Structure 1
Amino acid sequence: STLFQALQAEKNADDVSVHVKTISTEDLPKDGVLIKVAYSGINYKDGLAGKAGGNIVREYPLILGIDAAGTVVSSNDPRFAEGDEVIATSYELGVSRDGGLSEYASVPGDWLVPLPQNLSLKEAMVYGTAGFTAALSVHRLEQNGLSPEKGSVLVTGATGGVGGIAVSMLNKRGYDVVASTGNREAADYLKQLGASEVISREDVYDGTLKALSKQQWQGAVDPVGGKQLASLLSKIQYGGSVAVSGLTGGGEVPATVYPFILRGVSLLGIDSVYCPMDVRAAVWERMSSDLKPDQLLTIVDREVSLEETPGALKDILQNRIQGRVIVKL
């Protein structure tokens, strides 16, 4: 109907600046459900979406997104009605379509998952994509035989979004959680999240690439998939599983194959971007009861506002945010 404040990235010949422009509903896509967002949208993927050079967004007249949980204002789709609390994440939001780092977002009804009862519009955005990735990781690991009795579970990339919540989700489930960080003195935070043991990054990758190097952990959530991941698989127990979804500290994995063939481990790829609806909705249902931790609000580092986002976008992608940041609109 009228105008709103929006976080829009913009290209200047060869350079991207990221501005806070005032946009109307008329400029929003005419093929989606109009929703008052009110909450969040800032992740590591959005940090790359703001910085020039990162391989994410092509057409640049684009409002940054990835993550949105608000209320339906106007819907030309019978599947959704006025007053419906919905979560809009992933797919094309913030990649090729105007996302949720802004007041009001026109997102198709096919990507909208109704807000679970045991979660608020804030609580779902405390998770975000980093929370959904962590939950989908646990969901996929448990399909292959992850259970809290066959051994302790190691979570790399702790302190971060995916790893931090994955520690809390495993702790609520009942797993003995082992947290891995490159930052010391962070032990009195990961233990607060629910980690039984806090180890260094060297405790996972120091001896450098061995074929079969002693069983240590049952499962693994690994948002740090590189040379560390190749050494991680070598330390996994029999019938174990490792969930990837991470580009931190490496892109190439010099994996052997002996942990797979001889010790029956399974490397599982986690994609939050194009996850099917029936899987997506069922995961969000687990994030409300079965995998909803007593912590949740502890992984919150800053309650940032729409004005404080341009500076907070580069805080992630530099290890300045411990946990996750939420936007309020």
Structure 2
Amino acid sequence: LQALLLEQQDGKTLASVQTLDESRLPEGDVTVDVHWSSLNYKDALAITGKGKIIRNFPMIPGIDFAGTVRTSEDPRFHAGQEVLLTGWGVGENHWGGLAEQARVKGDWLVAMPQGLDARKAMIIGTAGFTAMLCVMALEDAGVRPQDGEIVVTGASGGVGSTAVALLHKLGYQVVAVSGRESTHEYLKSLGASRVLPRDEFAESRPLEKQVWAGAIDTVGDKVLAKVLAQMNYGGCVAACGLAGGFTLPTTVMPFILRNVRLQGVDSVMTPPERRAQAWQRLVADLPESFYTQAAKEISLSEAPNFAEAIINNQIQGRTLVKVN
């Protein structure tokens, strides 16, 4: 059993791949032979030791996995069945998916959606799952294509890439915000009508000119504050991230004078029914071209190279991890 393992000394996190035994895995009524995982921003924070994502060491990181069920004391799952997992504290406070085996509670698993397989499921991963929940939040708020432009921040990343592709597919005019010139052609190829620079979202009045029918935000901080000030009357912002900072120095003005909805989107504890709905929607609404335009396959032990890259804003798209 090969596993990426986090250890802690003198404050710092060390990441290495070690050969563990089956016996070291935590209790959990379903054992899964993991074939694929991925790197999300939260995984990168954990692996580099930034932000105190993980409080208990040693720890196998990886909030995502997909593979084949080895055994099951949960009668909903059987040996041979393709399953996936995102969230539920896995990869944070419970040994995760960046390993050839994981053991988890059956409630945390999702039976493989029809039209999907383990590889494609992990290209999507937590970031794509989260993008879908964000699109669904915009739809719950009555934001339709004809209402105006949708803005996506941190657009070149995982959630952002998925969001641009989903929205373009669903008929929306999408505007991407990126802090790098090198992402422009990639973002246009995903379906973005144009790409605005991040340095134009550094400061804002409480109320800016109305330009967005809706928004999907992955950066928080001053970018989210400006986006809120730019929302159309009745518009909605689906906020899922903190890539630019966890604080939100905003005002009540967009809320109380423009009836703006700021919908928070969490992926960790998404209830079973909405979880299943999001996956079903991804199979239908994410075009097959995405799985080759946005994905980069890496091996397990080179994950820390790419975790550093994520933190350092040197990553584009989705990092798929082949575990075997």
Interval containing the TM-score (normalised by the shorter chain)? over 0.9
After superposing on structure 2, the runs of 4+ consecutive aligned residues of structure 1 that deviate more than 4 Å are none
Question: In structure 1, which of residues 220, 227, 249 is the aligned counterpart of residue 215 of structure 2?
Answer: 220
Q: Distance in 1 between matches of 2:259 and 2:294?
A: 37
Structure holding more strand per residue:
2
Contact 2:27–2:104, Cα closer than 8 Å, also in 1: no
Q: Which runs of 5+ in 2 are unaligned?
A: none
Provide closer, same or farther for how the CA distance between residues 315 and 53 of structure 1 changes in structure 2, counting only shifts above 3 A.
closer
Pick aligned residue for 2:131 from 130, 134, 142: 134
Alpha-carbon distance in structure 2 between the residues aligned to 1:10 and 1:316: 20
1:120-164 CA distances to partner (integer Å, 9 max, x unpaired)? 111111111111111111111210111111001010111111111
Q: Per-residue deviation at 1:251?
A: 2.4
**Partners of 1:190 and 1:261 in 2: CA distance:** 34
Matched, 1:234 2:234: no
Across the aligned residues of Structure 1 and Structure 2, the Cα RMSD in angstroms comes to: 1.4
Q: Matched residue of 2:145: which SS?
A: coil
Report if the CA contact (8 A) 1:145-1:239 is conserved: no
- Whether 1:193 aligns to 2:187 is no
Question: One-letter code of the match for 1:276?
Answer: P
Per residue, is there more helix in 1 or in 2? 2
Which residue of 1 is the match for residue 66 of structure 2?
69
Q: CA deviation at 1:13?
A: 4.5
Relative to structure 1, the CA distance from residue 80 to residue 294 in structure 2 (aligned partners, 3 Å threshold; closer, same or farther) is: closer
Q: Which whole-Å CA distance do the structure 1 matches of 2:93 and 2:236 have between them? A: 33
Unaligned runs of at least 5 residues, structure 1: none
Residue pairs, 1:88-103, within 5 angstroms: 88-103=85-100
Number of equivalences: 323
Q: Which residue of 2 aligns with 1:257?
A: 252
For 1:138 and 1:102, locate their aligned partners in 2 and report how far apart those are by CA, in whole Å.
Answer: 31
The more displaced of 25-34 and 110-119 is 25-34
Q: What code does the residue aligned with 1:266 have?
A: R
Aligned residue among 273, 293, 301 for 1:307: 301
Of residues 193-202 and 251-260 in structure 1, the stretch that sits farther from structure 2 once superposed is 251-260
User: 1:316 — aligned with what?
Assistant: 310
Change (3 A) 1:32 1:198: same
Distance 1:166 1:10 in 2: 34
Distance in 2 between the 1:307 and 1:135 partners? 29
Q: Distance in 1 between matches of 2:217 and 2:194?
A: 16
Question: What is the CA deviation profile of residues 278-320 of structure 1, one whole-angstrom value per residue up to 9, with x for unaligned ones?
Answer: 111111111111x222432245352101122232221111112
Residue identity over aligned pairs, in percent, reads 47
Matched, 1:31 2:28: yes
Q: In structure 2, how many angstroms separate the alpha carbons of the residues matched to 1:259 and 1:13?
A: 45
